[PDB]
Coordinates of C-alpha atoms and ligand atoms in Angstrom, one line a residue:
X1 CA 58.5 39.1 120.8
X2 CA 57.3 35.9 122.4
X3 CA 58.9 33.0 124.8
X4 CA 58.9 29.9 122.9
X5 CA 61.4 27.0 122.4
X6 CA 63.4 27.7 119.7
X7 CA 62.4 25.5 117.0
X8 CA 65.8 24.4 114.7
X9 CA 65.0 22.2 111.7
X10 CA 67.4 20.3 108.9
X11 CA 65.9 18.5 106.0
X12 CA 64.8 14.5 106.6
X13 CA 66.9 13.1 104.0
X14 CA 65.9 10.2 101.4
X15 CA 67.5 6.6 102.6
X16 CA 67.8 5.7 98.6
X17 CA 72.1 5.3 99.6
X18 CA 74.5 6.1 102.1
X19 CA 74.5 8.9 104.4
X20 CA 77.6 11.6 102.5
X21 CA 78.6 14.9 103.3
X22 CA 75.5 16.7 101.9
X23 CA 73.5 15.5 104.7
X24 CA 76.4 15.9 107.5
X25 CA 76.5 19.5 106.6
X26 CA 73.1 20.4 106.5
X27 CA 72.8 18.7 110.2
X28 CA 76.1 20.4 110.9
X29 CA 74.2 24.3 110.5
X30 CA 71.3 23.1 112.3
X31 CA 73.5 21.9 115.1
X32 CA 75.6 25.0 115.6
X33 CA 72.3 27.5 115.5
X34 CA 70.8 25.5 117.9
X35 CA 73.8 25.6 120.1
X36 CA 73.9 29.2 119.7
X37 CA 70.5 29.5 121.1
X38 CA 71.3 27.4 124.1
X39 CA 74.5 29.0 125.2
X40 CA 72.5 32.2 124.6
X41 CA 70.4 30.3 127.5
X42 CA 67.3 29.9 125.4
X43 CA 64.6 26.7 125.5
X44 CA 65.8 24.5 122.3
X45 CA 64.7 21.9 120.4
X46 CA 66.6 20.9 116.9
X47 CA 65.3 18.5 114.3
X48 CA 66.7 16.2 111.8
X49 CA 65.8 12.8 110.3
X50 CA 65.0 10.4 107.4
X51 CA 62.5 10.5 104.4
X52 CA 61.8 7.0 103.9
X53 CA 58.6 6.3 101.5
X54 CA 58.1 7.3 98.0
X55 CA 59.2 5.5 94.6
X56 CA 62.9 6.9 94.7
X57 CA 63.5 4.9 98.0
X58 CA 61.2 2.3 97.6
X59 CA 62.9 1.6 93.6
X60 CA 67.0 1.4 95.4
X61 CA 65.2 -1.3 97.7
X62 CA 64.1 -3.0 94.8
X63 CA 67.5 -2.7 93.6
X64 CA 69.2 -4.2 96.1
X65 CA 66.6 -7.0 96.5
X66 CA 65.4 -6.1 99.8
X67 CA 61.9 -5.2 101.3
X68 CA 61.1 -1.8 102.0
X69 CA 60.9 -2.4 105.9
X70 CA 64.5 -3.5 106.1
X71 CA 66.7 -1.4 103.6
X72 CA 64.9 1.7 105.0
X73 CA 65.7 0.7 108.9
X74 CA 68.9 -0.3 108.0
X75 CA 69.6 2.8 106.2
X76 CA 68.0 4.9 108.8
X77 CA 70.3 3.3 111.3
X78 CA 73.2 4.4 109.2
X79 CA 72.5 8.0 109.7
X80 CA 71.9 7.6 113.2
X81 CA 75.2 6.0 113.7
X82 CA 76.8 8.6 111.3
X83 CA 75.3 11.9 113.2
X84 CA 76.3 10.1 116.7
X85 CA 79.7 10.4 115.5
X86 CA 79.8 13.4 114.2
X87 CA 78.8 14.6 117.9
X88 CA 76.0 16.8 117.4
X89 CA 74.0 18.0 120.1
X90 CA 70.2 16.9 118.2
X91 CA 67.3 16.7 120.1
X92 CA 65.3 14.0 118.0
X93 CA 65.4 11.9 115.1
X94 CA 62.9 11.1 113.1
X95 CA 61.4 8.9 110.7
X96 CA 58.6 9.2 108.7
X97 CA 57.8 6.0 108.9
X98 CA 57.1 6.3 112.6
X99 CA 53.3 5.7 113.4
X100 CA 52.6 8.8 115.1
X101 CA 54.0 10.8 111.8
X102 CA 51.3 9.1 110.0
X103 CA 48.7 10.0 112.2
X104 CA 49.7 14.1 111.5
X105 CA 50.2 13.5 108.2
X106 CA 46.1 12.4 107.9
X107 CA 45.2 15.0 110.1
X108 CA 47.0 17.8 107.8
X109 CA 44.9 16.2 105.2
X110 CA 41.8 16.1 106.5
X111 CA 42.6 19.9 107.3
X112 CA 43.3 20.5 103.4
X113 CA 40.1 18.9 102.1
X114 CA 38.2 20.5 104.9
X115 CA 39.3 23.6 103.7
X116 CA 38.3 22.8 100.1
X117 CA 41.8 23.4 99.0
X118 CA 41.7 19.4 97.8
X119 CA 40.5 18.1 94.9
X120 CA 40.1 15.0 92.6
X121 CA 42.2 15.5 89.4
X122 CA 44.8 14.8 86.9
X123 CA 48.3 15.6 87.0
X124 CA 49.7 15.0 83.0
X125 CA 53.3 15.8 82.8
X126 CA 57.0 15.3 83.6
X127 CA 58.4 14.3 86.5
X128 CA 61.8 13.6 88.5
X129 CA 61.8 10.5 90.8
X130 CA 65.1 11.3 91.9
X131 CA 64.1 14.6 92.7
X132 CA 60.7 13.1 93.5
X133 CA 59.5 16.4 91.8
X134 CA 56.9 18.1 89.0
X135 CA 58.4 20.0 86.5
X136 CA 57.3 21.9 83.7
X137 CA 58.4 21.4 79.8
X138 CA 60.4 24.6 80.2
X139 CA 62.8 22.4 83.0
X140 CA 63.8 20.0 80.9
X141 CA 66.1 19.2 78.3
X142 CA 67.7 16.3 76.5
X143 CA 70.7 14.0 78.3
X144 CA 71.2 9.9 78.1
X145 CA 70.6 7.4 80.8
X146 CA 73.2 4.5 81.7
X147 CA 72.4 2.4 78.6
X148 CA 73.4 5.4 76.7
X149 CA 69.9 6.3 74.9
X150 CA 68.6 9.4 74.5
X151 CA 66.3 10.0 77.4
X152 CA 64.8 14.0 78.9
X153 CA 66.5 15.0 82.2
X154 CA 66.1 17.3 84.7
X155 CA 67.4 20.9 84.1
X156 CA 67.5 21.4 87.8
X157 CA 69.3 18.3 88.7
X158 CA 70.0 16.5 85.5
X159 CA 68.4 13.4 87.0
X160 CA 66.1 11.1 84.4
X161 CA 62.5 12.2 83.8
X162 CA 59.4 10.6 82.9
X163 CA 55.9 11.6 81.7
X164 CA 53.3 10.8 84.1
X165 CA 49.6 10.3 83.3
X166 CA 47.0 9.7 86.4
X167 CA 43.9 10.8 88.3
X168 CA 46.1 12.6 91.0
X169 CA 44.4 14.6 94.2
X170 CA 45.6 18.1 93.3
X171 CA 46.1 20.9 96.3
X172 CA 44.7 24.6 95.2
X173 CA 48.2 25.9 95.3
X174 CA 47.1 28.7 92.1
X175 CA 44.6 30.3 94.6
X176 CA 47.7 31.2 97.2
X177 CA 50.2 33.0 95.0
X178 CA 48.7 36.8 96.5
X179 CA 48.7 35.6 100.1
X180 CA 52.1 33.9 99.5
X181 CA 53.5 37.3 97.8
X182 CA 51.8 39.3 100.5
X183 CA 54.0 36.7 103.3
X184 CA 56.7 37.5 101.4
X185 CA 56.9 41.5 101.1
X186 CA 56.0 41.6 104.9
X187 CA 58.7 39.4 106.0
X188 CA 61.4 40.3 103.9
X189 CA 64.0 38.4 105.9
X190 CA 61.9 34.9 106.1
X191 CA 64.3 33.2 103.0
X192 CA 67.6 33.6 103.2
X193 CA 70.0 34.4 101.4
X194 CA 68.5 37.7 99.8
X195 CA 69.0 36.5 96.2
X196 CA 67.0 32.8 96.9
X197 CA 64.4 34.7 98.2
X198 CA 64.5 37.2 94.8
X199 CA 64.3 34.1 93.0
X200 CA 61.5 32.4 95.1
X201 CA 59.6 36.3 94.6
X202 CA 60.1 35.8 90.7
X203 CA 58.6 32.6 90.4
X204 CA 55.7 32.9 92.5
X205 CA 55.5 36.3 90.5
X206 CA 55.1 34.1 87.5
X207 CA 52.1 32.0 89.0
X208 CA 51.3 28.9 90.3
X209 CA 49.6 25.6 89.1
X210 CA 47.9 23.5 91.3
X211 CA 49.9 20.9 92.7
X212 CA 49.8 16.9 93.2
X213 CA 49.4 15.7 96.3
X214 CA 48.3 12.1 95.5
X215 CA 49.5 9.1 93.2
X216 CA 48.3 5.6 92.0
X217 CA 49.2 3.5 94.9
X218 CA 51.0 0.8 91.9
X219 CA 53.0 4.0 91.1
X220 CA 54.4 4.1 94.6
X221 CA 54.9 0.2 95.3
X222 CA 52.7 0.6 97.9
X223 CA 55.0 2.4 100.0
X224 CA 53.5 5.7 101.4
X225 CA 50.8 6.8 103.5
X226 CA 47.3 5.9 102.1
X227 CA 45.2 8.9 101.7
X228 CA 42.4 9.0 103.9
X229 CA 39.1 8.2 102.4
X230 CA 40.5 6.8 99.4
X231 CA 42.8 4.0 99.7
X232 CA 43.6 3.3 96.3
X233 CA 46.1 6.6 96.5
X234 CA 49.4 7.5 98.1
X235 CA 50.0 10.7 100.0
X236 CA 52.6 12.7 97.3
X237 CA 56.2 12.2 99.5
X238 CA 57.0 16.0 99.7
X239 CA 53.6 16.8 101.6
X240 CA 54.3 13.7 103.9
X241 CA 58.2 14.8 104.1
X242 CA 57.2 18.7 105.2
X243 CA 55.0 17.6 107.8
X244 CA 57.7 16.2 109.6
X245 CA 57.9 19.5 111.2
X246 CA 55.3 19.6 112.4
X247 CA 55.2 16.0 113.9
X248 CA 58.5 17.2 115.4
X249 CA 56.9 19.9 117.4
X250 CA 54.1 17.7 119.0
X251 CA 56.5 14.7 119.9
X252 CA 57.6 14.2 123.7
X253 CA 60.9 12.9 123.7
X254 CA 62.4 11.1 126.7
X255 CA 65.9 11.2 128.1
X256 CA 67.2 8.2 125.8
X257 CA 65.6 10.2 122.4
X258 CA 62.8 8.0 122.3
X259 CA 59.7 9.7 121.4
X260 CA 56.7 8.8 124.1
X261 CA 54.2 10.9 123.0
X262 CA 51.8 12.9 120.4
X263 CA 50.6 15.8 121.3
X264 CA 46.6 17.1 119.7
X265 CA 48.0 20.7 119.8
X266 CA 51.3 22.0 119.2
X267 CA 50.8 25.0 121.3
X268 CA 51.3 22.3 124.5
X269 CA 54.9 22.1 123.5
X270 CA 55.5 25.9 122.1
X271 CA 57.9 24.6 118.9
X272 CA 55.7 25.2 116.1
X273 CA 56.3 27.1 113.7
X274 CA 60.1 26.7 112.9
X275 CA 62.0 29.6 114.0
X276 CA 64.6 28.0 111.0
X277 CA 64.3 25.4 108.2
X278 CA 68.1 24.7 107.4
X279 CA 68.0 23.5 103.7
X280 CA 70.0 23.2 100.6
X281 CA 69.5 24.9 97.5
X282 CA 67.9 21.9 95.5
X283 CA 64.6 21.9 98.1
X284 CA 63.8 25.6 98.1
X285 CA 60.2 25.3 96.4
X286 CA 59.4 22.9 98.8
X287 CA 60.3 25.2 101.5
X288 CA 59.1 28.3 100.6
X289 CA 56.4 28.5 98.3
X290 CA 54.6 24.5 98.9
X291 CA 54.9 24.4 102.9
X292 CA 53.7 27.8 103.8
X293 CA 50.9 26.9 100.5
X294 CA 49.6 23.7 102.7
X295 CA 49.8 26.0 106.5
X296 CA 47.9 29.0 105.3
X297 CA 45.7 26.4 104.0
X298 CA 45.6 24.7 107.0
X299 CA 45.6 27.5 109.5
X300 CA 48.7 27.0 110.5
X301 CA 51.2 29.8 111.5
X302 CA 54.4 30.1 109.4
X303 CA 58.0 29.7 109.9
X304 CA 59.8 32.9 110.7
X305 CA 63.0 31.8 108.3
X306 CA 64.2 29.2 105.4
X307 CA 67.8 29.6 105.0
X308 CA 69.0 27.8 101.6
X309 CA 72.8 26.8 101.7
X310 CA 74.7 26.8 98.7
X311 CA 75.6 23.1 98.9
X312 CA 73.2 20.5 97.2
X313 CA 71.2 18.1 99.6
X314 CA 71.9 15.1 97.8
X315 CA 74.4 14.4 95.0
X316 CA 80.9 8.7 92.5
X317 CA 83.5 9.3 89.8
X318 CA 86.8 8.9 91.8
X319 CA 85.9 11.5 93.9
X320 CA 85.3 11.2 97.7
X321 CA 85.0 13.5 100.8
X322 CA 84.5 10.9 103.9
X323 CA 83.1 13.1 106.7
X324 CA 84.3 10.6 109.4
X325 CA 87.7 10.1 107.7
X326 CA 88.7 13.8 107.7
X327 CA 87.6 13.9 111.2
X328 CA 89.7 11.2 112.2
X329 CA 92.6 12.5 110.5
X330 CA 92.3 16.4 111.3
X331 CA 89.8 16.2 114.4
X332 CA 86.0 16.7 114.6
X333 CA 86.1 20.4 115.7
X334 CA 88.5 21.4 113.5
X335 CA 86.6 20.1 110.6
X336 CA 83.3 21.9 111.6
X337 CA 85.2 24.8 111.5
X338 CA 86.6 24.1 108.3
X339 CA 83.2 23.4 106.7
X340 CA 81.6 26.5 108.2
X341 CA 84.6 28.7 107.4
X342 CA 85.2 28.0 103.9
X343 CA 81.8 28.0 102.9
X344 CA 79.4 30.9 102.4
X345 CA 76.0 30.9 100.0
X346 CA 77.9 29.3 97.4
X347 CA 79.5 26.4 95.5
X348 CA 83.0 28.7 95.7
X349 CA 84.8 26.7 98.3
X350 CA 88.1 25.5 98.1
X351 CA 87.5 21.7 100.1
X352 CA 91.2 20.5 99.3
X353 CA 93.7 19.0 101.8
X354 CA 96.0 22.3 101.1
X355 CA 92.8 24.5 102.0
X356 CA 92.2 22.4 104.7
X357 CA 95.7 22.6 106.5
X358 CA 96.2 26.2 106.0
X359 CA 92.9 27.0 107.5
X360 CA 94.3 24.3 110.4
X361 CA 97.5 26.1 110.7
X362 CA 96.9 29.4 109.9
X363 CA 93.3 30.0 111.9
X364 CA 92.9 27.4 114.9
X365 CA 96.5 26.7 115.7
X366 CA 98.4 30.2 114.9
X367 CA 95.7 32.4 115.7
X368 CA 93.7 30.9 118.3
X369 CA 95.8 28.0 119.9
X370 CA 99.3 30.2 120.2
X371 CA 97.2 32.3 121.9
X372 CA 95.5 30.4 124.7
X373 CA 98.9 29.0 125.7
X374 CA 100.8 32.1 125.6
X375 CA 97.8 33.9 127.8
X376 CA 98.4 30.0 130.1
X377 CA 101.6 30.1 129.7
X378 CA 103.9 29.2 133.1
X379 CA 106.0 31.7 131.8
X380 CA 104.4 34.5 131.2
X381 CA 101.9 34.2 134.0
X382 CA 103.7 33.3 136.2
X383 CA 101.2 32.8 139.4
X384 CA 98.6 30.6 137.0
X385 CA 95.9 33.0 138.2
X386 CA 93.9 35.7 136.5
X387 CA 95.5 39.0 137.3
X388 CA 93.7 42.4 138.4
X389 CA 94.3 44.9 135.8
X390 CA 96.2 47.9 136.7
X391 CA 94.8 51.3 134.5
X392 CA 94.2 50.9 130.7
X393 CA 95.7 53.1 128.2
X394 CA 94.1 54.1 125.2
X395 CA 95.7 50.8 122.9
X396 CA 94.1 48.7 125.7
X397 CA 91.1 50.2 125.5
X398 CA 91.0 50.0 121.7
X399 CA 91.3 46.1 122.1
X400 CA 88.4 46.3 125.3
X401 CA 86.2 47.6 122.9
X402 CA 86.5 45.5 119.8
X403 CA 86.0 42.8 122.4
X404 CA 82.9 44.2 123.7
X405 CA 81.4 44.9 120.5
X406 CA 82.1 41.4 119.1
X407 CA 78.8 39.6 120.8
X408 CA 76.5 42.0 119.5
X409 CA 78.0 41.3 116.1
X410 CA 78.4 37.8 116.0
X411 CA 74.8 37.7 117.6
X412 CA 73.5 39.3 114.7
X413 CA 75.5 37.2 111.8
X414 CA 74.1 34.5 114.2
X415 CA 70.7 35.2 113.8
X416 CA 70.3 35.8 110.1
X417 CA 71.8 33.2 110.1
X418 CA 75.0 33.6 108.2
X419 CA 77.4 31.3 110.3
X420 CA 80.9 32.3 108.1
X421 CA 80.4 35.9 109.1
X422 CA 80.2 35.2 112.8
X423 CA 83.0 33.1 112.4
X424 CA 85.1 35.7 110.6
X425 CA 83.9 38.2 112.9
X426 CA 85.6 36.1 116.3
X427 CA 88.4 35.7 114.5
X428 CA 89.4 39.5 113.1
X429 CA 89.2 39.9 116.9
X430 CA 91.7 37.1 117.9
X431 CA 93.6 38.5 115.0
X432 CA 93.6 42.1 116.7
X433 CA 94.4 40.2 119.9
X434 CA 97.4 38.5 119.1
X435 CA 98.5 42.0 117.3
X436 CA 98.1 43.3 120.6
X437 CA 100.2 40.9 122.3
X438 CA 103.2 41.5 119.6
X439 CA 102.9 44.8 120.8
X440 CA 102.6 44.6 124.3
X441 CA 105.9 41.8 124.3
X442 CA 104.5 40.3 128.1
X443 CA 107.2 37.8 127.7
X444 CA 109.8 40.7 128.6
X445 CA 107.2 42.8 131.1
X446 CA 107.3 39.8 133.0
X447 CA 110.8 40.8 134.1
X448 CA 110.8 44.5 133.5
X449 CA 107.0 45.8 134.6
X450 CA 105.1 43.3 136.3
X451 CA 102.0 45.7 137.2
X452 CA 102.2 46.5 133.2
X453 CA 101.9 42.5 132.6
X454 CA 99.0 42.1 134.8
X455 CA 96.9 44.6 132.7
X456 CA 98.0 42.9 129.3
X457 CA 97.2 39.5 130.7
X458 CA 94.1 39.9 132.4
X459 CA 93.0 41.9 128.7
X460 CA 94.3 38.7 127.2
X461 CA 92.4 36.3 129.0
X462 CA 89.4 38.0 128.7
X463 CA 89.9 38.5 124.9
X464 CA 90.0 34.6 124.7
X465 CA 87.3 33.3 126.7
X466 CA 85.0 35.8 125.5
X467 CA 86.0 34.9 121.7
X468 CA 85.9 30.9 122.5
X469 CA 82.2 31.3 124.2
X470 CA 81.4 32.8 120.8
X471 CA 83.1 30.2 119.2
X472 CA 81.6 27.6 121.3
X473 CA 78.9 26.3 119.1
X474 CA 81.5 25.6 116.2
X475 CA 83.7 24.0 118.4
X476 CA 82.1 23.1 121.4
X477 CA 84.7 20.0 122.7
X478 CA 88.2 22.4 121.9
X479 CA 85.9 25.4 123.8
X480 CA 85.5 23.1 126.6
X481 CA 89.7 22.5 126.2
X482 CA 89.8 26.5 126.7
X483 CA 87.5 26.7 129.7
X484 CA 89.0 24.3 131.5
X485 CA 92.8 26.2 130.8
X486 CA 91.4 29.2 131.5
X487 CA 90.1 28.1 134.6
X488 CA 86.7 29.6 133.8
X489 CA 83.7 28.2 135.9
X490 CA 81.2 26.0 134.3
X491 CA 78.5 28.6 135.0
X492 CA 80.4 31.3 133.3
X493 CA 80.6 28.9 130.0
X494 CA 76.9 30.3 129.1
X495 CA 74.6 33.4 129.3
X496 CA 74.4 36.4 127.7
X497 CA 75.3 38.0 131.0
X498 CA 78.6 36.5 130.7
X499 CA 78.7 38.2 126.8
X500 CA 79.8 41.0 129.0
X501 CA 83.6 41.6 129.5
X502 CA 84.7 40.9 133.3
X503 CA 82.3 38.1 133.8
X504 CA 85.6 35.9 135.6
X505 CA 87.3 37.6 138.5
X506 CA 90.4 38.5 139.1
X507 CA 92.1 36.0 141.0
X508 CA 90.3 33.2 139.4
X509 CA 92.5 30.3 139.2
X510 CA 93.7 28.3 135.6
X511 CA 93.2 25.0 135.2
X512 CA 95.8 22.5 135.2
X513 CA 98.9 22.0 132.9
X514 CA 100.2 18.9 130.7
X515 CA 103.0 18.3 129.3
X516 CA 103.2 18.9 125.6
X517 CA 99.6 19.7 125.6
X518 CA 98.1 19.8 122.1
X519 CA 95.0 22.2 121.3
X520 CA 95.2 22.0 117.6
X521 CA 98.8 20.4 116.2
X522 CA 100.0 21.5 113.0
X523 CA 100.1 19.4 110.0
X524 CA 103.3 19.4 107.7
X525 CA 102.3 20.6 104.0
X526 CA 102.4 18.2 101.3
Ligands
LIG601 C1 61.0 17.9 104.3 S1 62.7 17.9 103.7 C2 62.8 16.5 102.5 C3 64.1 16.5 101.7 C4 64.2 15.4 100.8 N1 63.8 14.1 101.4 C5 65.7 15.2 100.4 O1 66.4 14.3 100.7 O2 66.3 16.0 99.6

């Protein structure tokens, strides 16, 4: 198509609590497809941050008796502290209470009205503040509150609802349902998975009310961006959360992450649009049918892809999942894995300590860490050096060619992006690898055919660095680990050219030994 950076989004996250899993996971899937695209060799730039204004957030600072300025940087903080240890490669945080935010925020406005697509009206009707969303009398049902009285909740989330009266600017969004069908039948891989986007087609299908994109500034505790023109209203959250995207593609960003700079025109720094919003389940109107509502509007181009995850965005009774404890206790890598492993486009994973160690054991130490030290071994090559292969027979060349089919695949389960597919994919090849290896016993060629050895080794070593660079944005310290016992130079750790098997020479030497060295240890069952 075109050369552009690669433009990798997660959602900006409400500062209401504590950053939890939810959110580490979402910036988890942004992380890894943007660290995909860069060891592919590609321009990237991936996205995450904070949703700070609106009545949800400004009501938990209220709770906790502290202005809005201070609970929402010390919050913010919190995040920034949790993603730096979760050692993600992002390329900016923001915040949408950062000034120059504002300023795109007005200017999307001022685009809207221009258009005529804004108008002064009434929204009368429920609404979640949790959620911080409109909802129809057909999602809603009866529940209780904390005092126990009966009170209307969400059906979506089952958070409290209330009935909202006010003169409200309303966006056209009834006047986009064709065009928005019509984006949706020509791009029939722009919301994934398949079945959220059947569902987005279905509702849209329905039709479409207009939309509020204004409140009562005493609604909002005055904490939002003032509408321009009419300072007696608050810009609705949701329209100033989504343009955080855009903001994100016209910010220069120094070496520290500090932005410097606003760009007038996104084209100058060739992000915009998203080539993938990463977002849970709970935000997909949002996403799908309110953005691309507001940029057609606008005339702005689309993103290429929304991918929906099945976990929920935001969501304690004496049950916790500490992202920073599990990674302290069974490692960083080996956690991302886990998370990315056992979860597909679903709620169906099994996120217990048994699961957990099994995956441990069974996957990254059995399958993959046996492996690189038995292919590193002193005993089984014996001159620490990557052999020269002597002629294949037809079981090598079985095993040559699963291995130089693999990028292609795992490029593709990559790119819709369905991250458990390309993991499962790497790993039915380290599978047929070790299989191999059984077969081939090099632990008694190494005394009985040496030239034989040298063919089942070099195979062996080029199985595993070619699996690990495919593994490499899921576990990109322990693929570093590999590299370096491989012996494989740095400029051979990215490229598509070195997706292609016999990228390392022969004769290429392994890195250095340790005693008792420990890739992933097993951890007793219990
Ligand atoms: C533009 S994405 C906004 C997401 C929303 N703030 C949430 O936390 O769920």
């Amino acid at each position: 198509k075109v050369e552009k950076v690669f433009f990798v989004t997660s959602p900006i996250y409400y500062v209401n609590a504590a950053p939890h899993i939810g959110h580490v996971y979402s910036t988890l899937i942004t992380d890894v497809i943007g660290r995909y695209h860069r060891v592919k060799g590609e321009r990237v730039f991936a996205l995450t941050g904070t949703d700070e204004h609106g009545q949800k957030v400004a009501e938990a600072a209220k709770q906790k008796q502290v202005s809005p300025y201070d609970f929402t940087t010390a919050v913010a903080g919190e995040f920034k502290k949790c993603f730096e240890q979760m050692d993600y490669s992002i390329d900016y945080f923001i915040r949408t209470t950062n000034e120059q935010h504002k300023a795109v925020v007005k200017e999307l406005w001022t685009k809207l009205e221009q258009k005529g697509d804004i108008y002064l009206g009434r929204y009368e009707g429920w609404y979640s503040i949790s959620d911080e969303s409109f909802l129809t009398p057909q999602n809603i049902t009866d529940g209780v509150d904390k005092d126990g009285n009966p009170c209307k909740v969400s059906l979506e989330s089952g958070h409290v609802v209330t009935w909202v009266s006010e003169e409200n600017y309303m966006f056209r969004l009834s006047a986009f349902r064709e065009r928005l069908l019509e984006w949706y039948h020509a791009n029939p891989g722009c919301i994934v998975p398949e079945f959220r986007r059947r569902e987005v087609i279905r509702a849209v299908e329905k039709g479409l009310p207009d939309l509020s994109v204004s409140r009562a500034r005493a609604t909002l505790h005055n904490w939002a961006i003032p509408v321009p023109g009419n300072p007696d209203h608050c810009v609705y959250v949701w329209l100033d959360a989504l343009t955080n995207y855009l903001t994100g593609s016209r910010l220069r960003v120094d070496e520290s992450g500090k932005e410097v700079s606003l760009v007038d025109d996104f084209n100058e720094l060739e992000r915009f649009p998203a080539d993938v919003h990463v977002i849970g389940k709970d935000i997909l109107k949002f996403h799908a049918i309110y953005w691309p509502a507001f940029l057609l509007s606008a005339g702005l181009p689309l993103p290429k892809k929304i991918v929906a995850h099945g976990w929920w965005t935001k969501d304690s009774l004496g049950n916790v999942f500490d992202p920073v404890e599990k990674a302290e206790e069974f490692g960083y890598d080996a956690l991302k894995y886990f998370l990315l492993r056992e979860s597909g486009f679903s709620d169906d994973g099994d996120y217990s300590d048994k699961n957990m160690i099994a995956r441990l054991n069974g996957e990254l130490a059995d399958t993959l860490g046996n492996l690189v030290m038995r292919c590193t071994s002193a005993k089984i090559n014996v001159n620490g050096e990557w052999p020269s292969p002597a002629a294949y027979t037809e079981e090598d060349e079985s095993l040559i060619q699963l291995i130089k089919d693999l990028p292609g695949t795992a490029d593709h389960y990559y790119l819709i992006p369905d991250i458990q597919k390309a993991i499962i994919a790497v790993f039915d090849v380290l599978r047929a690898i070790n299989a191999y290896v059984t077969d081939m016993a090099p632990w008694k060629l190494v005394k009985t055919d040496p030239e034989r050895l040298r063919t089942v080794l070099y195979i062996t070593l080029e199985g595993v660095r070619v699996t690990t660079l495919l593994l490499s944005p899921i576990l990109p310290r322990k693929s570093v680990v590999i590299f370096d016992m491989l012996g494989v130079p740095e400029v051979h750790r990215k490229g598509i050219e070195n997706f292609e098997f016999g990228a390392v020479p022969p004769g290429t030497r392994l890195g250095p030994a340790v005693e008792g060295e420990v890739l992933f240890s097993k951890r007793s069952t219990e």
